[PDB]
């Protein structure tokens, strides 16, 4: 449907009221089923209208016009619904031509720390609601962890690169508003082993199927067997994979044993039969001589001498019957024994090559979570799986920077302004920043509220890059300590001619060892110009940051030379190497669900801080210090859409507090 699709594109259930809606419309959700369906339709329809054309503001009046009875009957209901949707940034978010210009009279003053997507998204919403907004940004540019390299026609993202499906993605709305060149990624990705030879198709499929079986197994180990604590410490994903592999190696050995154990049983039956046959051959041999000696006595003979020949004759045919029956039994055991030698069970679980190709699939997983698998929580690493978008993954040909720059228009952004101290009290806040160039030039910003979009890496930094006065409570700092902040780097290789296959968007490279499985494990080609982008993932990311760009470019050319040949690989015109862990305005790439953490910590990070009263026995103050960013959004962590959504959320929470709901 069209109304049902609008709810889906807004990540809302089309036929049910959410928790957020229950809070703003308790009268409706506590009331009769008919009023709820009216509410749900108005919401779904208002969304459809906004989504069908998100380039121009959808006003309340415009909404009411396009509604029909009995839904357009109640005007206060339609107004309440439109207001909720606007406030919570489900309509009139991003970059829309405004119908009624913003009132010159601004209400309330907000300082926003960071000009990343989370910061910019919040700032626009707040300015849109008529608050006074100023962003403080340490960098000389906006976009933060969305960073695009540019020189001539060369264009490559060192930060966010991929739109992970448009189905329910708010970047779908932003892509209709901003000119992003969204180009589908072709899933086809060939591997190339240490030498430079493609993994044989039949084998590639086998290892990939084993990787997915191994993952599926860790999930079973977690949810069914409850293998989630070991020696008080919480179980890592890496530990679970080790345990699952060892159990598969055990079974291979257990299997061999049982097969050789049934061969000895057959050989011990054969031994016991052959012994019975050797002893019977001797008794037959002896009894034949006895028959001969009896038959030597020529007729005529008395009946006892005749009986002796006859009795020995019958006794010898009897024993010759047994031996023939035993020779039958021997033949079928010798056949059974040849069938067991013919069908031996599996020699090994995985060969040295298999384990190297499997290590690439682990590197892919270490890339995705931007951390070694030994750090990931087994139970909760995939806790956001249910909220994943539908549709093909896309890249930005223009570069992702086109988005924040678009969002930055019309906003009071102080660049080269590094926040040092955040002060929050019952009367309001003051933020103390410095000029990044001359660190002695000091700035003081007084505000009603502070929105902190500082990355988890920065919040973790010990000793602190930013001091909170008073200090953040134990429940906030404990969450910061518990949560994982990963690392993932990119090597940009700019050439004058394409020596790679243009139809293949990305191709893997298998590492020599487990230790180096993340090191330049994957190459991306997603641009018009001849640019190849190499990923450094897993344990490699941290270590490769202490190595010069030349050496790194060297190792890249080597690996490329091995696949396409020395003649085909020229020296790159331009080279760039990201070092996100060393970047003091990031201190890493993006959040991961660390062992001992959960999605619940992401919710603690989103919780605003309320200062104590100034004078004792004074009423409970309002909240002053708010938090947004990828580490604050539990259902969309470590993404640009997550950042975007976290910004919209805090804008609504701040507006509701300082302008009223």
């Amino acid at each position: 449907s069209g109304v049902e699709g609008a709810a889906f594109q807004s990540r809302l259930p089309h036929d049910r009221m959410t928790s957020q809606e229950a809070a703003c419309f308790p009268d409706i959700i506590s009331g009769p089923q008919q009023t709820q369906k009216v509410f749900l339709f108005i919401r779904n329809r208002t969304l459809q209208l906004w989504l069908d054309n998100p380039k121009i503001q959808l006003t309340f009046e415009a909404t009411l016009q396009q509604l029909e009875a009995p839904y357009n009957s109640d005007t206060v209901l339609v107004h309440r619904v439109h207001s909720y949707l606007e406030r919570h940034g489900l309509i009139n978010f991003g970059i829309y031509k405004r119908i009624k210009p913003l009132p010159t009279k601004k209400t309330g003053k907000v300082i926003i720390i960071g000009s990343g997507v989370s910061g910019l998204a919040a700032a626009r919403q707040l300015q849109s609601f008529g608050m006074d907004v100023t962003l403080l940004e340490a960098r000389d540019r906006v976009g933060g962890r969305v960073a695009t390299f540019r020189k001539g026609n060369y264009v490559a993202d060192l930060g966010a690169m991929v739109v992970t499906g448009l189905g329910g993605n708010p970047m779908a709305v932003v892509s209709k508003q901003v000119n992003m060149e969204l180009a589908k990624i072709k899933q086809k990705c060939p591997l190339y082993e240490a030498n430079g030879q493609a993994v044989p198709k039949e084998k590639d499929e086998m290892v990939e199927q084993e990787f997915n079986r191994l993952l599926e197994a860790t999930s079973y180990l977690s949810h069914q067997l409850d293998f989630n604590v070991l020696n008080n410490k919480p179980v890592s994903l890496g530990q679970a994979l080790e345990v699952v592999i060892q159990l598969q190696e055990k079974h291979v050995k257990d299997e061999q044993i049982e097969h050789w154990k049934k061969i000895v049983k057959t050989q011990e039956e054969l031994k016991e039969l052959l012994n019975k046959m050797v002893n019977l051959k001797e008794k037959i041999k002896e009894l034949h001589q006895q028959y001969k000696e009896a038959s030597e006595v020529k007729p005529p003979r008395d009946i006892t001498a005749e009986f002796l020949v006859k009795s020995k004759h019958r006794d010898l045919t009897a024993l010759c019957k047994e031996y023939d029956e035993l020779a039958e039994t021997q033949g079928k055991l010798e056949e059974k024994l040849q069938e067991l030698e013919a069908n031996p069970p599996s020699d090994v679980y995985l060969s040295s090559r298999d384990r190297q190709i499997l290590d690439w699939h682990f590197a892919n997983l270490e890339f995705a979570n931007a951390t070694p698998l030994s750090t990931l929580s087994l139970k909760h690493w995939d806790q956001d799986d249910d909220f994943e978008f539908t549709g093909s993954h896309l890249t930005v040909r223009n570069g992702y920077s086109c988005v924040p720059v678009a969002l930055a228009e019309g906003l009071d952004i102080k660049l080269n302004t590094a926040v040092r101290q955040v002060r929050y009290t019952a009367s309001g806040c003051e933020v103390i920043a410095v000029n990044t160039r001359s660190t002695s030039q000091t700035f003081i910003y007084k505000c009603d509220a502070v929105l902190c979009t500082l990355p988890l890496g920065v919040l973790k930094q010990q000793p602190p890059a930013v001091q909170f006065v008073p200090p953040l409570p134990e429940w906030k700092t404990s969450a910061v300590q518990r949560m994982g902040f990963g690392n993932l780097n990119k090597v940009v290789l700019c050439f004058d001619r394409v020596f790679w296959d243009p139809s293949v968007n990305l191709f893997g490279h298998v590492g020599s060892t487990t230790a180096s499985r993340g090191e330049l494990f994957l190459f991306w080609n997603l641009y018009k110009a001849p640019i190849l982008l190499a990923l450094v993932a897993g344990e490699a990311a941290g270590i490769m940051e202490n190595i010069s760009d030349d050496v790194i470019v060297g190792r890249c050319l080597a690996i490329l030379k091995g696949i396409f040949g020395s003649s085909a690989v020229p020296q790159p015109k331009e080279t760039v190497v990201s070092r996100w862990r060393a970047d003091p305005w990031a201190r890493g790439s993006y959040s991961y669900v660390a062992a001992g953490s959960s999605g619940n910590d992401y919710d603690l990070m989103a919780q605003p801080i309320t200062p104590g009263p100034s004078i004792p026995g004074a009423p409970q103050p309002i909240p002053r210090l708010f938090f947004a960013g990828e580490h604050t959004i539990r259902n969309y962590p470590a993404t640009v859409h997550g950042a975007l959504l976290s910004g919209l959320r805090e804008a609504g929470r701040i507006a509701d507090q300082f302008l009223g709901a």
Binding site: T164, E208, L365, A368, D382, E388, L522, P637
Partner: peptide
């Protein structure tokens, strides 16, 4: 997270 995995099946 999981979403970023290459060759997702």
């Amino acid at each position: 997270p999981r979403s970023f995995l290459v060759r997702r099946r």
